[PDB]
Enzyme design. Structure first.
Site: not given
Lengths: 132, 543, 518, 230, 480
Positions: E12, E45, E348
């Site tokens: 992540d 991201t 999400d």
């Protein structure tokens, strides 16, 4: 009773003479008290002071033996101070060191404890010391 | 080496990436493989672990070594966690899992050096794992060829090889195998599981070891209380009455104590207290029972009726043993006689039929043998030998052999061990890889070659030439699989493994080297998971 | 951190050789002295093998394991403290070239070592000679070897008899096909401890066929001699009992404090009646016993002993058979310790006694030692322990083997002869074991100042062509007949030394790496 | 074949070290043997200096570094608790015996052979000592022999000038406590006192006791004749 | 590896950036961009950082050509505006009132999680939860007002939205606990009901039995007075903040409140109080002296719901202007992993639905919009003149970084994938892209691989802002 301590305590330099000095006491109902003197007629606490260096063999062996004793000798005080934080210029040549206090006074000054019993010191060597 | 102190990318710590990390992970896995290598197989060598104080321990148990092994590496601890998870799930075989994972990582690094992307390697390894699982499923078998064939007999002999009983193993193995096979049952809700505890062991000094007998029935570890009752009743046809209700002298009232000085009142109280148990006993006598088994014991006063009726009573009976005896004899243990508002044993309703019941005298404690049940399928082992020391050693050896054989039997789905699975999977995956391509052939071939480490390590630990043994194993497996399309086999057979004692290739099914399918499947799957997890690390930052 | 390849095996072998070489000179009457230097200014010149192996610090784990093995054998067996280490080190040194130069796998060496152990035991059995374990004269002559030339040389004559009598009292000679051979189940550490009685002489010492208790009668008005004794053991004290949970005593009037005494009397009377129900003659309680309990038990015609340590009861249950019950109310009639000899309390040397002996074989006894001083008593106790260990070794197998290295030379010769016919790769380790067996005669020759080569060759030739009773003389240093010179060692010691050394060598060879771990 | 934090001597190194230490100790105590010997100067570091010649005192006070020398000194010190003299003789004999033993060992003689020869020679020397001694008479007029013995003992420790003073003092002190009878001898009956600001030759003998505390009044008699002690 | 010795492994971007402990002040602009993307988009991201890096490389190349940084920033801003316009042109619009489209998008987002077969319930749950507060044409809606309450027990199918607000603490299980109360007013209490407990030195001095009795009576009277003051304010639901120095509600206080018909809930953490400050619309009470009706909320009924061990207190029918429909979705599950995965999946889905709400419509994934925008910008820049044409060409070339990275990470031929996408885009439009499922270039639209347009738009905008900020720094100085 009282089951007073039960474990090895860490000491910082500022409290060395507080935690060791405090050998000079009993507690309420553990001895006679008198006129203008509340101190017990009997003696104080046996305090086993370990001056250790983490890098040395015997220091590592004793950390094990001291805690193991503490777990059974509930009434006996066991403390540890990094040797380098106890004595200015503590020499490695004396390492590890055990000083035994009682009633505020010094009883034993055992130096390079690797020779205090077997090099691979067992609880048998330490319990033979603690009864002397 | 020791890539650090980067001139750019000023972060909170050192950072490395790429081939350096891959090589470091490979080196860590090889280091762990070196530690776990000697612990693979029964012929493995012990390794010593030393702490920072001066104490040490010696053992060849891979799980213990891995648990106590000091590993300080971000990728190395992955193998330790893998071994711990395998121990939690399987409890054995962690050494093989670690070795397989290390070999897989090494081959994956070799592929990476050959311009093979890590994702392609992972995908190919997963495809190979799925194909290997399919092959394993295709080569599974249940508990077959165990009765009348030397399948569990060799297991017992191997377990008995380290005990005095090894001399008479040729017979004791057959005894234990028959005893444990006979007790086959569905357990609960069709679980298909042999009894956890069964096959009692007795000791005798008559004849010799070869005369050891299998009692066709149950045995009770207790006495018959009073000696006035016959020790053997109705040899032609003896019935057993199993009752759980206590026959011990009852009290007039639980909360009342008897303090009476009048002989008449004392006699009345004693008459009532003894009469409760006498009526309980009469409810059994009227049923025609010849042997009475009481779980809670029988008092002396009430045994008078049995003595007069020539009925042998048994005290302190085990509930499970009595339940099994009653069920095998067509009866059922009576939990209590207080049905509705009455008190009776349902004469002739809970009495089992047996061919012969006799109090058999053996070494140490005596026991009562119940033989000739309608359907019990169980048996007890009577040990015979030169002296009591040999009898006790044989008793311990029988316990160990029964434990191992029961463990083998409980696994209703097993696959041959001793490298059979690894070599068969290697051959199957080598054949399969030639039909895939698409950049996955190299990964599948390397994964297949990885499984060859286990047989090689086993051969090395056996003090034999690993190359020759592995080549012969591969040739046997290739010959066995090559004849599959022809649907004919005369000299080609599968399930060949490595004999680490004689250094030969033998059929492990007959030899006695088998492991459950779940063990191998989980081992391979977890090894691949660990290898993938290690491969997925391409960046390391130490703050 | 990690060691791979032959390096770990080389390290282990070097550690074993270093350990062995130190004590290589500790064998024989001509053993050389050694200097132990502490980090301080103190040092000693002790020549005791056990002391050398105890005060020597070794860093390598294999050396620590070897030292632990020797220390364990020092108590398991009466002799062989240094022989085991020397033999194991020599075997490891001989097997080293095969593992390093011949590329022989450790498994083959271990298997060959086990087979050589079996062969050596067989040869030791073959060469041993029988002894008369029933004739006291032969046993005294044999045991005098470990008693003479010591502080107890003055009393050796009676020391031998005392030790033999104690061992025979604890020795159970039984042979049958039902229970097997008990192996005499000799236990000296637990049930042979010597009782030191000041005064008297060694000749006045006697062996008690039972346990001697130093606890005197707890009340003067108590029987001191029972011709039909029966011992009952209990733990729960006979006194006022409180509840399991918190108990509080509330008394209003001062005279009402007698209620506690009345309750104590009732409970103690009930417990004493329960104890007396089993027809006892002596009541032993581990915990304290109140005066009321003593009075009640005396009313029943039995003696009372209170605050008796568990150590006394552990041996009483062995020599009297009395069963100990924690709770008095749970005492059973079958717990009474019948078949007890006497409760005689005759005093010897102004000391209190309580004899619980009998004409049975409980495999337990007590040694009533007498002496003119405490130092004499302690020295006699140590010498008696050593002599009883030697006697136990001798009696456990009615045979002895020749000393002076003759047994080792014969074992080496026979092992070589048998290995010549094996026709297998394992032949090399068998020859290594045979050569390593020669360590003992080499040490004896070196300590005697003779020729380490010519004397050994002559001894080997004599064994090959002559008898196996030839060995190295302790004083002359020449090859002489052990039987003629009376040089012998128990067969048990030789068998145990060989077995332990070979097993230790195999165990060390099994370890192929030392890794860090906690 | 060694362990860390340890040092050992192999082959004949231990014998050479022991011989060297013994020779060094002998040379240390070689010069102070006999009346013609010298004196050793010891400094404790606190400002106190001791000039001593007796072997026992020198060994006890002096620090010894060589472990073999420490062992030799400790073994020789037993003479003080048994006979009271001969420590220097013991050290010299040990040193010369070790010199000769090392010389023979260099020729290949095993140490055990030398030890056995030393034991045999010790037995022969004990026999010679038994045959060579002279029996002293029990006469009470043996004061001359006691004076000779005292002179012989003192000449080894004094400068031959204080001998004339100490010989009669020692002889009389020992004779007075042990009368011409079996009884027993106890040197605790002889008190030892020290006084300062006096000449070394002033040492004298007092038949009785001397009290530390004196009078505190000018009118008390300086001397009292035939006094009754209260 | 953190300074505390803990080892963190994860792919992540947010966690990696946070744990990297970036020390360079300018490089922290990437962490700021990631935080902004999470706040606005909630995903991608990694894409924003990759775009920022590509733009930085393009700016470096332009500088090597002699172009001033300010012109680079201006031209990048113009190119970003044009790219955003192009992206918005090709977006497939959707309607928030059409539950089917939102459910499909939520299912597509949830398909990446372990819980897939149960997505048919998770998707509509999030869709309805968002719609209850977003309706239609509401512009940007903050999903942070939606609370996910986890409770051990039940299964995945066990869930509830509660259009009002849900508390995470149970009612008093001891004697006197009503467990519910209709026509209830809920207030946030920061103090505790206990006898006088001065924060400074204090003690109780007794010289007689009467004094002890007086002190005990005073303490009981103080507790009763506190309870009566609470009741007089008409606060039927008592929410006591957790405290370790003063008893939250003394036993005597509990009995008094029960006699006063006051619902009591204690052991409430600060986070719950902060959430209820908006969910209930009330205000906290600093002390009992300030406890009044104006600080209380309202509700039709407050009760503890226990269907299969849920034991959750809920507030419904607030009917207060300050209070807002802060839907608090209840998550149930026997295992902790089930509830954790459900919470993550719902988060999400809520992020995806928020992206749809702010900018309605989805775009094809797999880098297809990036390739199409790059091609269109490259074609258009030919009509430009001066430094602008060069900067636009560099921007178009840099835009292809995302598809290149996707191809490289997928184990595909990096150069071949870009050419295949470019060739396919000559016939299709926002239809073909990189998909890991097919291990190659396929029709992402037909593969149900769709991403909100807002994600790409915000990524482009944030990358442009970050590159402008980085290029605008011309000197570094120390200030203390």
């Amino acid at each position: 009773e009282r089951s007073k301590f039960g474990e090895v305590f860490h000491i910082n330099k500022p409290e060395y003479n507080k935690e060791v000095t405090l050998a000079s006491q009993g507690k309420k109902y553990e001895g006679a008290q008198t006129n203008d003197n509340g101190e017990e007629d009997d003696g104080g606490v046996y305090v086993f002071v370990h001056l250790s260096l983490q890098s040395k063999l015997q220091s590592r062996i004793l950390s094990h033996l001291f805690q193991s004793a503490a777990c059974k000798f509930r009434e006996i005080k066991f403390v540890e101070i990094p040797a380098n934080r106890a004595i200015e210029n503590y020499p490695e040549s004396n390492c590890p060191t055990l000083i035994v206090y009682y009633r505020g006074e010094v009883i034993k000054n055992m130096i390079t404890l690797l020779e205090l019993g077997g090099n691979n010191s067992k609880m048998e060597d330490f319990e033979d010391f603690m009864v002397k | 080496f020791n890539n650090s102190r980067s001139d750019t990318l000023f972060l909170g710590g050192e950072k490395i990436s790429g081939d350096d990390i891959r090589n470091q992970n490979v080196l860590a896995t090889m280091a762990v493989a070196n530690v776990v290598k000697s612990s693979l197989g029964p012929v493995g060598l012990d390794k010593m672990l030393v702490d920072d104080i001066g104490d040490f321990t010696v053992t060849n148990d891979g799980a213990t070594i891995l648990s106590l092994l000091d590993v300080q590496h971000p990728a190395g601890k992955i193998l330790v966690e893998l071994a711990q998870q395998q121990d939690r799930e399987i409890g054995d075989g962690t050494t093989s899992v670690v070795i397989i994972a290390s070999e897989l990582l090494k081959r994956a690094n070799e592929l990476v050096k050959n311009k093979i992307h890590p994702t392609t390697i992972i995908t190919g390894f997963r495809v190979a794992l799925r194909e290997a699982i399919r092959f394993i499923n295709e080569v599974l078998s249940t508990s077959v060829d165990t009765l009348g064939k030397e399948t569990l007999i060799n297991i017992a002999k191997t377990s008995m090889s380290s005990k005095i009983i090894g001399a008479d193993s040729d017979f004791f193995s057959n005894m234990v195998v028959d005893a444990l096979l006979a007790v086959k049952t569905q357990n609960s809700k069709g679980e298909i599981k042999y009894p956890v505890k069964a096959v009692n062991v007795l000791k005798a000094h008559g004849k010799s070891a070869t005369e050891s007998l299998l009692v066709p029935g149950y045995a009770l570890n207790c006495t018959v209380a009073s000696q006035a009752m016959p020790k053997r009743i109705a040899g032609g046809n003896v019935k057993i009455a199993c009752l759980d209700l206590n026959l011990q002298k009852a009290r007039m009232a639980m909360g009342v104590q008897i303090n009476i000085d009048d002989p008449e009142q004392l006699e009345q109280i004693r008459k009532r207290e003894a009469g409760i148990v006498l009526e309980r006993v009469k409810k059994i006598i009227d049923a025609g029972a010849q042997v009475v088994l009481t779980t809670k014991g029988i008092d002396d006063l009430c045994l008078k009726e049995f003595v007069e009726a020539k009925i042998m009573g048994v005290r302190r009976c085990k509930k499970e043993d009595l339940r099994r005896i009653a069920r095998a004899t067509g009866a059922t243990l009576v939990s209590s006689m207080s049905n509705l508002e009455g008190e009776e044993t349902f004469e002739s309703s809970y009495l089992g039929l047996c061919d012969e019941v006799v109090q058999a005298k053996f070494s140490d404690d005596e026991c009562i043998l119940i033989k000739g049940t309608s359907k019990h399928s169980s048996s007890s082992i009577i040990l015979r030998g030169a002296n009591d020391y040999s009898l006790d050693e044989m008793e311990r050896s029988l316990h160990d052999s029964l434990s191992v054989v029961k463990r083998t039997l409980e696994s209703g789905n097993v696959v041959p061990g001793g490298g059979c699975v690894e070599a068969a999977l290697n051959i199957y995956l080598d054949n399969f890889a030639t039909t895939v391509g698409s950049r996955e052939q190299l990964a599948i071939a390397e994964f297949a070659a990885a499984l060859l480490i286990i047989p090689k390590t086993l051969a090395v630990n056996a003090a034999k030439d690993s190359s020759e043994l592995v080549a012969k194993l591969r040739s046997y497996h290739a010959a066995s699989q090559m004849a599959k399309p022809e649907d004919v086999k005369r000299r080609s057979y599968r399930n060949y493994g490595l004999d680490l004692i004689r250094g030969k290739i033998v059929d492990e099914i007959h030899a006695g080297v088998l492991e459950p399918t779940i063990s191998k499947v989980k081992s391979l799957k977890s090894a691949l998971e660990a290898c993938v997890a290690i491969l997925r690390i391409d960046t390391m930052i130490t703050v | 951190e990690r060691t791979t390849g032959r390096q770990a095996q080389i390290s282990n072998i070097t550690a074993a050789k270093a350990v062995a070489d130190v004590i290589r000179t500790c064998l024989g009457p001509k053993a050389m002295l050694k200097m132990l230097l502490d980090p301080m200014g103190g040092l000693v010149l002790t020549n005791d093998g056990h002391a050398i192996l105890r005060e020597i610090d070794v860093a390598h784990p294999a050396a620590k394991s070897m030292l632990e093995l020797s220390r364990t054998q020092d108590e398991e067996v009466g002799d062989g403290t240094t022989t085991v280490i020397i033999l194991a080190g020599e075997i490891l040194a001989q097997c080293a070239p095969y593992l390093i130069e011949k590329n022989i796998h450790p498994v083959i060496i271990i298997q060959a070592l086990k087979k050589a152990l079996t062969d050596a035991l067989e040869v030791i059995k073959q060469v041993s000679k029988p002894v008369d374990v029933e004739n006291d004269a032969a046993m005294k002559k044999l045991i005098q070897a470990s008693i003479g030339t010591k502080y107890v040389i003055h009393w050796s004559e009676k020391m031998c008899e005392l030790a033999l009598d104690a061992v025979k009292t604890v020795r159970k000679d039984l042979g049958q096909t039902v229970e097997g051979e008990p192996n005499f189940e000799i236990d000296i550490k637990r049930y042979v401890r010597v009782e030191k009685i000041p005064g008297g002489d060694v000749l006045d010492s006697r062996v008690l066929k039972g346990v001697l208790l130093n606890k005197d009668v707890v009340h003067p008005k108590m029987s001191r001699h029972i011709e039909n004794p029966r011992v009952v053991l209990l733990d729960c004290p006979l006194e006022y009992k409180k509840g399991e949970s918190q108990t509080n005593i509330e008394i209003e009037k001062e005279e009402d404090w007698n209620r506690i005494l009345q309750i104590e009397e009732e409970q103690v009377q009930l417990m004493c009646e329960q104890i007396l129900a089993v027809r006892p003659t002596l009541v032993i309680t581990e915990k304290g016993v109140s005066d009321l309990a003593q009075h009640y038990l005396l009313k029943g015609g039995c003696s009372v002993l209170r605050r008796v340590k568990k150590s006394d009861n552990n041996r009483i249950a062995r020599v009297t058979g009395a069963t100990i019950v924690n709770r008095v109310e749970d005492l059973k009639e079958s717990d009474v310790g019948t078949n007890c000899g006497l409760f005689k309390v005759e005093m010897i040397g102004d000391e209190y006694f309580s004899f619980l002996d009998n004409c049975k074989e409980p495999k337990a006894c007590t040694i009533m030692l007498r002496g003119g001083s405490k130092d004499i008593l302690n020295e006699i106790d140590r010498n008696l322990q050593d002599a009883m260990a030697v006697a136990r070794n001798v009696m456990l197998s009615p045979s002895l083997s020749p000393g002076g290295g003759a047994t080792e030379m014969a074992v080496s010769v026979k092992l070589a002869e048998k290995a010549k016919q094996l026709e297998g790769i394992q032949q090399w380790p068998y020859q290594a074991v045979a050569d390593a067996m020669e360590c003992i005669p080499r040490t004896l020759i070196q300590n005697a100042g003779g020729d380490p080569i010519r004397l050994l060759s002559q001894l080997r030739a004599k064994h090959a062509q002559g008898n196996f009773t030839t060995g190295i003389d302790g004083d002359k240093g020449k090859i002489v007949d052990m039987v003629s010179y009376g040089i012998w060692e128990p067969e048990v010691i030789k068998q145990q030394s060989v077995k332990t050394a070979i097993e230790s060598a195999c165990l060390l060879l099994r370890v192929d790496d030392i890794v860090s771990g906690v | 074949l060694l362990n860390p934090k340890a040092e050992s001597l192999r082959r004949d190194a231990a014998l050479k070290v022991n011989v060297t230490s013994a020779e060094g100790l002998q040379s240390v105590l070689e010069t102070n043997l006999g009346p013609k010997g010298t004196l050793k100067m010891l400094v404790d570091g606190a400002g106190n200096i001791k000039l001593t010649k007796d072997g026992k005192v020198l060994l006890t006070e002096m620090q010894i570094q060589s472990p073999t020398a420490v062992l030799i000194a400790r073994a020789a010190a037993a003479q003080d608790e048994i006979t009271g003299d001969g420590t220097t003789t013991v050290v010299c004999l040990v040193g010369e015996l070790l010199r000769q033993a090392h010389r023979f060992i260099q020729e290949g003689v095993h140490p055990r052979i030398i030890t056995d020869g030393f034991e045999i020679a010790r037995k022969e020397s004990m026999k010679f000592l038994d045959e060579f001694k002279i029996s002293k008479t029990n006469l009470s007029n043996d004061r001359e022999f006691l004076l000779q013995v005292a002179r012989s003992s003192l000449l080894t420790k004094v400068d031959a000038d204080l001998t004339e003073v100490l010989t009669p003092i020692v002889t009389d002190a020992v004779l007075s406590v042990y009368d011409a009878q079996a009884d027993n001898l106890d040197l605790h009956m002889v008190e030892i006192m020290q006084m300062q600001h006096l000449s070394p030759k002033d040492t004298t003998f007092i038949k009785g006791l001397v009290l530390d505390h004196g009078g505190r009044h000018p009118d008390m008699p300086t001397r009292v004749k035939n006094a009754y002690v209260l | 590896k953190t300074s505390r010795g803990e080892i963190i492994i994860s792919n992540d971007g947010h966690t990696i950036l946070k744990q990297m402990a970036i020390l360079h002040p300018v490089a922290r602009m990437l962490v700021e961009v990631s935080a902004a993307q999470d706040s606005e988009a909630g995903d991608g991201t990694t894409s924003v950082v990759i775009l920022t890096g590509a733009l930085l490389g393009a700016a470096e190349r332009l500088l090597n050509k002699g172009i001033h940084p300010t012109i680079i920033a201006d031209s990048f801003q113009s190119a970003a505006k044009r790219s955003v316009d192009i992206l918005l042109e090709m977006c497939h619009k959707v309607s928030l009132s059409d539950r089917e489209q939102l459910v499909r998008a939520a299912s597509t987002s949830l398909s990446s999680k372990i819980v897939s077969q149960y997505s048919s319930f998770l998707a509509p749950l999030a869709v309805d939860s968002v719609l209850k507060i977003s309706d239609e044409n509401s512009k940007n809606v903050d999903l942070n007002d939606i609370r996910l309450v986890k409770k051990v027990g039940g299964t995945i199918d066990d869930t509830e939205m509660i259009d009002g607000v849900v508390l995470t603490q149970t009612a008093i299980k001891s004697a006197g606990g009503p467990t519910r109360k209709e026509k209830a007013k809920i207030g946030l209490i920061q103090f505790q009901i206990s006898p006088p407990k001065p924060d400074t030195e204090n003690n109780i001095i007794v010289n007689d039995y009467r004094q002890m009795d007086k002190i005990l009576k005073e303490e009981r009277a103080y507790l009763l007075n506190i309870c009566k003051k609470i009741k007089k304010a008409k606060c039927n639901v008592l929410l006591i903040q957790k405290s370790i120095l003063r008893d939250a509600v003394n036993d005597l206080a509990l009995h008094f409140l029960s006699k006063l018909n006051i619902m009591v809930v204690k052991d409430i953490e600060r986070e719950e109080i902060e959430f209820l400050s908006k969910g209930l619309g009330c205000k906290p009470i600093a002390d009992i002296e300030l406890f009044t009706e104006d600080r209380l909320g309202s509700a039709d009924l407050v009760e503890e719901i226990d269907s299969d061990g849920s034991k959750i207190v809920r507030v419904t029918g607030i009917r207060n202007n300050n209070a807002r429909p802060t839907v608090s979705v209840v998550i149930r599950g026997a295992n902790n992993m089930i509830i954790d995965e459900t919470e993550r999946s719902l988060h999400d889905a809520l992020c995806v639905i928020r992206c749809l709400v702010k900018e309605r419509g989805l775009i094809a994934g797999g880098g297809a919009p990036e390739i199409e925008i790059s091609r269109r910008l490259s074609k258009e820049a030919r009509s430009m003149e001066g430094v602008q044409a060069f900067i636009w060409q560099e921007f178009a070339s840099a835009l292809e970084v995302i598809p290149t990275t996707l191809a490289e990470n997928a184990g595909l031929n990096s150069i071949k994938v870009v050419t295949e996408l470019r060739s396919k885009h000559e016939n299709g439009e926002l239809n073909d892209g990189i998909s890991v499922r097919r291990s190659g270039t396929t029709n992402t639209y037909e593969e149900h691989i769709l991403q909100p347009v807002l994600v790409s738009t915000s990524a482009i905008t944030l990358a442009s802002e970050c590159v402008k900020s980085i290029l605008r720094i011309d000197d570094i100085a120390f200030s203390r």
